[PDB]
Amino acid sequence: THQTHAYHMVNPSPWPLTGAFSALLLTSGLVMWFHYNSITLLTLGLLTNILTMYQWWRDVIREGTYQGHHTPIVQKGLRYGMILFIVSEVFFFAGFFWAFYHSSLVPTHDLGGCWPPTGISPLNPLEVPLLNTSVLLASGVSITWAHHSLMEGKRNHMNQALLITIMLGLYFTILQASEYFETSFSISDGIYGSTFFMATGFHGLHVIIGSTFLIVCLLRQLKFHFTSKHHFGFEAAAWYWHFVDVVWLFLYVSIYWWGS
Amino acid sequence: VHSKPAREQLGVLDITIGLTSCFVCCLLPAGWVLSHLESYKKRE
Amino acid sequence: GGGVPTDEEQATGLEREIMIAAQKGLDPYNMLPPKAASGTKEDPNLVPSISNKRIVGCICEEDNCTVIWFWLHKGESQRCPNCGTHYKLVPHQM
Amino acid sequence: MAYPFQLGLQDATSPIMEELMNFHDHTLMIVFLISSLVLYIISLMLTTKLTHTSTMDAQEVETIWTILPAVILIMIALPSLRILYMMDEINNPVLTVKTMGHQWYWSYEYTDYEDLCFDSYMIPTNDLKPGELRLLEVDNRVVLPMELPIRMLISSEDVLHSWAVPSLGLKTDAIPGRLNQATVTSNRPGLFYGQCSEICGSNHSFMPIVLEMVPLKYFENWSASMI
Amino acid sequence: FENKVPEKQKLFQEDNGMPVHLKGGASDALLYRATMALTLGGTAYAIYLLAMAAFPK
Amino acid sequence: GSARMWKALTYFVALPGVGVSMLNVFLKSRHEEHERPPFVAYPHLRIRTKPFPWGDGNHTLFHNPHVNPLPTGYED
Amino acid sequence: MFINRWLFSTNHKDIGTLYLLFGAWAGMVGTALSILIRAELGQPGALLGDDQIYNVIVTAHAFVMIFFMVMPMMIGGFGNWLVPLMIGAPDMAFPRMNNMSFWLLPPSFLLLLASSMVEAGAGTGWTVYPPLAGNLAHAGASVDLTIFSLHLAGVSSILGAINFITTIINMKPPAMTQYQTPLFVWSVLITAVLLLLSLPVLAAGITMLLTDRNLNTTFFDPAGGGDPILYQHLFWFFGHPEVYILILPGFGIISHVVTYYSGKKEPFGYMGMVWAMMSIGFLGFIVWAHHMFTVGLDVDTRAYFTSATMIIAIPTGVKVFSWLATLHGGNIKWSPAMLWALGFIFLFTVGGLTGIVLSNSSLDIVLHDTYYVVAHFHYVLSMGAVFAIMAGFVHWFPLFSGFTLDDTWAKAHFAIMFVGVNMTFFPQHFLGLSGMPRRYSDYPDAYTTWNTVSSMGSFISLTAVLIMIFMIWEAFASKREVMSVSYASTNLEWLHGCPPPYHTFEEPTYVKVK
Amino acid sequence: SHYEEGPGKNLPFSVENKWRLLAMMTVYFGSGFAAPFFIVRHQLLKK
Amino acid sequence: KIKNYKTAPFDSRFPNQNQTKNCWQNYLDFHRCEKAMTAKGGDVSVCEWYRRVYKSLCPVSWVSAWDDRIAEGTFPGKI
Ligand code: HEA
Ligand code: HEA
Ligand code: CUA
Ligand SMILES: [Cu+2]
Ligand SMILES: [Mg+2]
Ligand code: NA
Ligand SMILES: [Zn+2]
């Protein structure tokens, strides 16, 4: 009753500061892992940032569903901020694709002027990338089914849909690692290997983030957090996973069908 | 923008103190380093 | 039948209070632009406040780019300086 | 080659520099025009006493403020486009010389016939012979003959350098794995001084470029004699 | 898997002055204390390690 | 109606599609026994300018001895 | 109380206070780096021995005065104070990641300082151009620490951009549209959009460089099939946005100070003002190769990029002419911020025309990375962004803290600053035309005199900085309050109180019913 | 209210003692101005 | 033919200034000339002009590295 406006007043939280210093710890741990080969501070930084993100998102859930501070105009702000982060990462991967096409459209004299560079046979797109695309497209259509099950009000149906999607996503990650094991060449191996391993590895990190975010939204639903209208966790899940789907479609088409 | 009178007006000495202190104190680092730049250069 | 919980019995707090406000049709927490566009002396523009002192930003000509912000205090209907439309303050305590 | 109290550019050796300086004085007329304009208008707004703080009229002069700088920039950029087009016209490369920027120094190759390669460091301040110049003298000049367009293929071995001769009017960034093409032309014999213009490490300031421009016959005399 | 959100909600609108990031009892207070001691303890270890790299043996 | 349509597409299109793609890869992986290519020390492959910050510095993070030769050769 | 309020900050005003503190500290550090450069360049010969340490100092100067001074002062500080108070919002949209971006900036500065500490040094310049940053020329750690500081600054600016766009488009009062906000809100909105569509390109480039240094990838190694021209493409596709993030809040705050101290209740051509803001923001992307006129590009691409450079030149001219028009017919009150704004207008004009002279690629075939471009970006940056910063600093200080500034001492600070920085940056025209390339510690006879005059002017600028910080102390010691603020009916930030209370806009602004 | 507000009390430092404020501003800006000089003499000693 | 020039002329295939592609193509089709006319029995000295053009265009370190790669069998070209 003290606050007339419908916006949200955030209580003082330490986790901005602790996440900032965890980013400090992560960067320094990468420095002393690349140069002075010490794993310890890198592991400490990983633990700090993972734990800080854990209870930061715990606290934002606590003010969202346990206090009802996520007023619909704040929900509009959350949707805007999520879309802005998605388009920022779209431009991040667009810079990666710019690097790939700068390597691709003008093959250098070192590579023989031919793409793919000689000495490597690229993995064929016909079987395992089709399996990848089928998994991601099935995951996307299952997420759409789950969201419309939220629209209808069918909890059992969207639980089944979410377990199906998470099974597909973890299958995609494990066979992503499997073909990483079963590819003929590495990241430190040619400009082709460098660029597609960098792009696919950043995409693998992003689909790992999406899979864990699906774990969070499913475990929130299993504790009845989501409702029929205020389900921005699953809205962000659908948005992020469709971002993953379209980025994988772009990467698949470009890398696996251009110069392969 | 009209301004209310200074609650703690600074005297000629107070103004001198702040001005002189600021100049000398801020010049101290550079001055001392510049004076001993050769000494620092010495790998010794 | 219900399956997933529904927010009209699940959500509590500020979100619930403004859902109650939305379903009874009046907004006390400034979600929407206000009403009663009439700025005469005898019928000024009604401004709701939980206090006796509140900012109002008058766009006092149509499609005017710059806003004229000024305060309202409890009392007579203070008018916009560069146009002259009147505003009077009501306390809601909500 | 630069002189103390220098106001403009080092004087032209190439016709591309002659047109470059004519266009430079054109752009200088534009900047002085606009600067004098904004100075005098600013003095109007400082020194006036009348006030107009009313409801302004907006879209009455903005059409003039759109059409006037547009044609200003058009007549600026049309000589720019013309000069940029004539840098790479139909060339007759009578000679080809390639530069390889090495770690804080240069190497030069005249490989068109009887493959010739030499190096280029910078003559130290204490090792200078009397009468020379500081930081621009080089123990091995680059020998080229006048009145000829010579292809110059400029690359680097380790780090990005930048072959720059502001007297003759050239600057290309020497990038490893990519040789860039320039044309040298001259209307005057003698010595021209330039430097590396891209940062390359612990002695970036210590690699200049020196061009001695000689007649043809002395050029092949030097080339056949230095081996 | 039963519904215990509405009972968990009323453990979050206590007007006792306890802030939102410590309102979950004592367990989140211990997690707060542990992360506060270990980001700073990591930070002092990082600054010491950067100093040790900056001043070689 | 939307949720029922998406459920039907998932069960009758997406799941059979993943089944067919999995069967394709599974049959191929049983017939293909790839003839490891002969080692050629191409100067643009297996570049090592700095050791990796793990192991011996010469093995990649997802190294596979059967298919990924070192700058010197296969390990066998 | 202190740790709960400042270390655990959650409101935009205190977060902007901490921005101002960090910006002033970074300005002191960069000022000392500048006097280091000019003291080494005020004498022919090698004062510091080999100029590897000189490259370290120029890199540190560039990084701390760009990615630690002007962004956290204008984009961070001034915007983070103002735009909630400008639009009527109580707080910012995402104050938690606002505070995270803040308290993650000093780790980036600590990475910079420790990188300077490391023996390898940041001997790459402001650009971190490979293969100079590769393992052959900087086998060490300092370039990696600078790149990780670049990562941290990038993440902080990204989260700030998210928060700024969200608070601008969301917390408007519901009946006013997008085109009714004050000009600084529009400028910082275009600035934050430029941040959001620019910074991931920087992150891609610097992550790519990290993986080339450490993870043995060959993206910029031509012996591995890579290409450094990709790094100049990525870095300058971020670098002309860098320009326009550092400039556009300056446009907004100078527009506010000229329309405040000119007596106008309207800036001239506000609709065209916003058009020109969006125009230079949209063409900031497609002009990126004007820094690569000497790398060996196509003639057609060079022509297209210099033509687009004229097309991005024209709406900035619209901005300048609209500034003269909003100066026109106004009772110009001689407040020191007005003097700072006038200096900004003139010196921005001359720096921009120097930029046009650069933008002719036929001139950059001889003029690239001489001291002429140094004169360009110090005419337009060391006085553009800096003069804007002091204009907003001496304009909003009674709002920010509550203590006004003595007019005579503030104009004194402006006077020493103006004459010193003009004497500093006018001779590099002659240095560049004579042809002294960038990042040189030592310099011959033909550049000796002008370099000496610039060094003396830089020491005058140091004296001006001392006057500024004495002025800060004098305000903090005199502690005079504000009797009244004129034009508070138009400026929303001033009417809430000098200084405003901790929780602003607990009552939302009654927007017009219409 | 919960945080004290007023002219000059919203700063993280104290304002009441002008000489104490002078001393702490002096050590703050002196550390800021002296940091890169101490850097460059550190590499001069190291090299 | 048996043309005797002093310097390699302007090639209209690459009007731009990035002539490393010009030297790369010259060296590639010079070796293609060698293999083709040694297979067909034609005169190998027809593309001595190709030899002279790649020697004139791209640097001695590059051509020495490429010749060593050709000689001990690790070349990335289509030769
Ligand atoms: C404050 C930062 C800032 C700003 C605003 C600008 C603005 C501009 N810059 Fe610059 N620039 C830099 C910072 C900046 N730049 C830096 C830091 C570098 C080099 C970095 C490095 O090399 O590593 C650089 C380099 C740089 C180069 C490369 C030079 C070289 O090294 O070869 C070029 C050339 O195209 C250029 C052009 C321009 C142009 C055309 C503008 C314009 O936007 C200026 C517009 C301003 C105006 C005021 C317009 C003029 C209009 C009028 C005066 C009105 C009247 C006009 C008419 C009637 C026609 N800049
Ligand atoms: C914001 C950017 C910025 C600013 C202000 C400056 C300011 C100055 N720069 Fe800067 N400079 C660059 C950005 C900047 N520079 C960049 C990007 C390069 C290229 C680096 C490279 O080549 O890699 C460069 C390069 C550069 C060189 C090239 C070195 C070389 O090539 O050998 C030189 C030398 O003369 C120089 C000198 C100066 C001087 C004398 C000032 C003076 O103007 C300093 C005076 C200005 C101030 C002191 C700012 C005011 C700050 C305060 C008063 C403190 C803040 C406190 C409050 C606001 C309360 N600069
Ligand atoms: Cu080579 Cu600088
Ligand atoms: Cu630019
Ligand atoms: Mg360059
Ligand atoms: Na020097
Ligand atoms: Zn009105």
A56 and A118, same domain (yes or no):
no
Strand partners, C56: C70, G510
D181 Cβ contact partners less than 8 Å away, ≥ 6 residues apart: D151, D152, D153, D154, G296, I17, I18, I19
Q: Does E6 sit within 8 Å of C10, measured CB to CB?
A: yes
Please name the residue that has the structure tokens 């597909």.
A168
Residue G343 corresponds to which tokens in the numbers above? 């200096």
CB G375 within 8 Å of CB G428:
yes
CA distance G77 to G14: 10
Q: Is the Cβ pair B26, G480 closer than 8 Å?
A: no
Residues A101 and A44 placed together within one structural domain of the fold: no
Shared-domain flag, residues A46 and A173: no
> Which numbered ligand comes closest to the C-alpha of C81?
7
- The span from the CA of G366 to the CA of G124, in Å, is 22
- Residue in chain A closest to E27 (alpha carbons) equals A55
For residue D126, count other CB atoms closer than 10 A to its CB.
5
Q: Please, are residues D201 and D35 in contact by the beta-carbon 8 Å criterion?
A: no
Question: Chain H contacts of B26, Cβ < 8 Å?
Answer: 29-30, 33
Beta strand C53-58 pairing with C45-49:
unpaired
DSSP string, G116-167: HHSTT--TT-SS--TTTSSTTT--SSHHHHHHHHHHHHHHHHHHHHHHHHHH
Residues touching ligand 3 (Cβ under 6 Å) are: D 101, 104, 161, 196, 198-200, 204, 207
Both tokens of G253, joined, read 């705050």
- The 3-state secondary structure of G272-323 reads HHHHHHHHHHHHCCCCHHHHCCCCCCCHHHHHHHHHHHHHHHHHHHHHHHHH
**Dist. CA G342–CA D46, nearest whole Å:** 10
Please name each of the domains of chain G with its CATH number. Answer: 1-477 (1.20.210.10)
For residue A8, the enclosing domain spans: 2-69
Total residues found in chain E within this entry: 57
DSSP G370: B
Q: How far apart are CA C46 and CA C37, in angstroms?
A: 9
| Whether G31 contacts G462, CB under 8 Å | yes
- Kindly report the backbone phi and psi dihedral angles of residue C69, in degrees, each rounded to the nearest multiple of 5, phi listed first: -95, 135
Do chains C and I touch by CB distance (3+ pairs < 8 Å)? no
| Domain segments of chain D as ranges | 15-85, 95-226
Side chain identity at G242, as an amino acid letter?
E
Sheet holding C78-79, edge to edge: C45-49, C86-91, C78-79
Taking Cα atoms as reference points, which of G270, G264, G281, G359 lies closest to residue G316? G281
For ligand 2, whether the C-beta of G62 sits within 6 Å is yes
The ligand minimizing its distance to the Cα of G490 is 7
Of A10, A44, A69, at which residue does a domain stop? A69
Please give the Cα distance from G132 to D171 (Å, whole number).
19
CA distances from E3 to A158, C7, C8 (A): 17, 14, 16
Which atom of ligand 1 has the smallest separation from the CA of G385? Answer: 1
How far CA G204 is from CA of D17, G104, G161, G207, G234, in Å, comes to: 40, 20, 18, 5, 8
By the CB < 8 Å criterion, does B6 face chain H? no
Going by C-beta distance under 8 Å and a sequence separation of 6 or more, which residues neighbour residue E55? none
In short, whether G426's Cβ falls inside 6 Å of ligand 2 is no
- CB-based contact, C25 to chain A, within 8 Å: no
Residues of H with CB under 8 A from a CB of G: 1-3, 5-8, 10-12, 15, 18, 21-22, 25, 28-29, 32-37, 39-40, 42-44, 46-47
CA distance linking residue A86 with residue A68, whole number of Å: 26
Q: How far are the Cα atoms of D110, D117, G46, I4 from residue D145, in angstroms, in the given order? A: 13, 17, 36, 22
Would you say C65 is a known binding-site residue?
no
Chains F and E touching, counted as 3 or more CB pairs less than 8 Å apart:
no
The Cα H3–Cα G508 span in angstroms is 21
Q: Could you tell me if I73 lies within 8 Å of chain A, comparing CB atoms?
A: no
Helix (H, G, I), strand (E, B) or coil at C68: strand
- Residue A169, token pair as written in the block: 């996503």
Query: In the block, which residue shows the tokens 């992003």?
Result: A206
Q: What is the largest CA-CA distance in chain B?
A: 60
Distance between CA atoms of I70 and A12, rounded to whole angstroms?
A: 68
Report how far residue G261's alpha carbon sits from residue G258's, in angstroms, rounded to the nearest whole number: 5
Could you tell me the CA-to-CA distances from G175 to A4, A26, C35 in Å, in that order? 18, 45, 11
Is G156 assigned a catalytic role? Answer: yes
Which ligand 2 atom minimizes the distance to the CA of G31?
A: 48
3-state SS record for chain D? CCCCCCCCCCCCCCHHHHHHHHHHHHHHHHHHHHHHHHHHHHHHHHHCCCCCCCCCCCCCCHHHHHHHHHHHHHHHHHHHHHHHHHCCCCCCCCEEEEEEEECCEEEEEECCCCCEEEEECCCCCCCCCCCCCCCCCCCCCEEEECCCCEEEEEEECCCCEEEEECCCCEEEEEECCECEEEEECCCCCEEEEEEECCCCCCCHHHCEEEEEEECHHHHHHHHHHCC
Closest CA to A108 of G224, G234, F46, G129: G224
C-alpha–C-alpha distance, residues G31 and G461, integer Å: 9
Q: In what side-by-side order are the strands of the sheet with D161-165? A: D142-145, D208-214, D190-196, D161-165, D170-174
Asked if G252 and G188 touch (Cβ cutoff 8 Å), the reply is yes
Q: How many CA atoms lie within 13 A of C9 on its CB side?
A: 7
Query: CA G302 to CA A81: how far, in whole Å?
Result: 37
Are F47 and A191 contacting, i.e. CB atoms less than 8 angstroms apart? no
- Sign, CA dihedral D165-D171-D175-D181, equals negative
Q: How many domains does chain A have?
A: 2
Check pocket membership of G309 for ligand 1, CB cut-off 6 A. Answer: yes
Please give the helix or strand (H or E) that residue G420 lies within, else none.
helix G407-425
Residue of G384, G403, G421 whose CA lies nearest to G479: G403
Residues paired with residue D105 on neighbouring β-strands, in sequence order:
D102
Q: Which of residues 27-46 of I touch A (CB under 8 A)?
A: 28
Active site residue G503: no
**List of chain A residues whose C-beta atoms are within 8 Å of the C-beta of residue E5:** 65-66, 223-225
Residue that has been written with the tokens 């702000």 in this structure? A77
List Cα–Cα distances, C25 to C21, G25, G512, in angstroms: 6, 53, 20
Residues of A in contact with E11 (CB under 8 A): 66
Q: What gap in Å lies between CA D57 and CA G237, rounded to an integer?
A: 38
Both A99 and A21 in a single domain?
Answer: no
Directed axis angle between helix F2-9 and helix A128-152, to 10°? 160
Q: Is D196 annotated as a binding residue?
A: yes
* Closest by Cβ to D81, choosing from G44, G303, G357: G303
Please give the radius of gyration of chain I, using alpha carbons only, rounded to the nearest integer. 13
Hey, are the CB atoms on G469 and B26 less than 8 Å from each other? yes
What string of H, E and C letters represents the secondary structure of chain B? Answer: CEEEEECCCCCHHHHHHHHHHHHHHHHHHHHHHHHCHHHHHCCC
Separation of alpha carbons G367 and F19, rounded Å: 64
Which residues touch B14 (CB under 8 Å, ≥6 apart)? G477, H18
Report the DSSP pairing between strands G510-511 and B2-6: unpaired
Resolution expressed in Å: 3.6
CA distance from start to end of chain I: 23
Amino acid type, B40: Y
Mention every residue, 6+ apart, whose C-beta is less than 8 A from residue G276: G315, G316, G318, G319, G322
Spatial neighbors of D176 by CB under 8 A, at least 6 apart, are D155, D156, D157, D158, D159, D160, G131, G222, G223, G228
Here the tokens at position C33 are 């632009």
CB < 8 Å to C72, chain A: none
d(CA A120, CA F37): 9
Inter-chain CB proximity H40 and G48 less than 8 Å = yes
Peptide bond into F51 cis (omega under 30): no
Sign of the alpha-carbon dihedral angle for A113, A114, A117, A120: negative
Instruction: For Cα atoms G354, G357, G362, give the angle at the middle one, nearest 5 degrees.
Output: 155
Q: Which of G38, G240, G302, G413 is catalytic?
A: G240
* Opening angle at CA D57, ends G191 and G330, nearest 5: 80
Q: Position G290: which residue type? A: H
User: Any idea which fold D15-85 has?
Assistant: Helix Hairpins (1.10.287)
- From the list G35, G38, G139, G8, the residue with the least C-alpha distance to G451 is G38
Technique employed here was cryo-EM
Cα–Cα dist C56/C45, whole Å: 11
- Is the Cβ of G223 closer than 8 Å to some Cβ of chain I? no
Cβ–Cβ under 8 Å, residues G414 and G347: no
Do A194 and A230 lie in one domain? The reply is yes
Considering only CA atoms, which of E10, G166, G112 is closest in space to residue A66?
E10
* Strand D116-120, strand D142-145: pairing: unpaired
Are residues D142 and D213 in contact, defined by beta-carbon separation less than 8 angstroms? no
Ligand 6 center to residue G38 CA distance, Å? 9
Ligand nearest to the CA of D171: 5
Mutual orientation of helices A190-222 and A72-104 as an angle, nearest 10°?
160
Q: Is G236 in the pocket of ligand 1 (CB under 6 A)?
A: no
Residues of G in contact with E50 (CB under 8 A): 110, 114, 117
User: From CA D148, how far away is CA D171, in angstroms rounded?
Assistant: 19
Superfamily per CATH, domain D95-226:
Cupredoxins -  blue copper proteins (2.60.40.420)
Annotated binding site of G for Na(+): 40, 45, 441
In a shared domain, residues A6 and A127 = no
Tell me if residue G91 is catalytic: yes
Q: Confirm if G103 and A17 have CB atoms less than 8 A apart.
A: yes
How many angstroms separate the CA atoms of A99 and G234, rounded?
Answer: 8
Name the residue facing E3 among C5, C12, C13 (closest C-beta): C5
Dist. CA D12–CA D25, nearest whole Å? 14
Q: Which helix (H) or strand (E) segment is G17 a member of?
A: helix G12-41
Extract the tokens encoding F73. 């050769």
Considering the domain architecture, whether residues A65 and A75 belong to the same structural domain is answered as: no
* Catalytic hit among G12, G264, G291, G302: G291
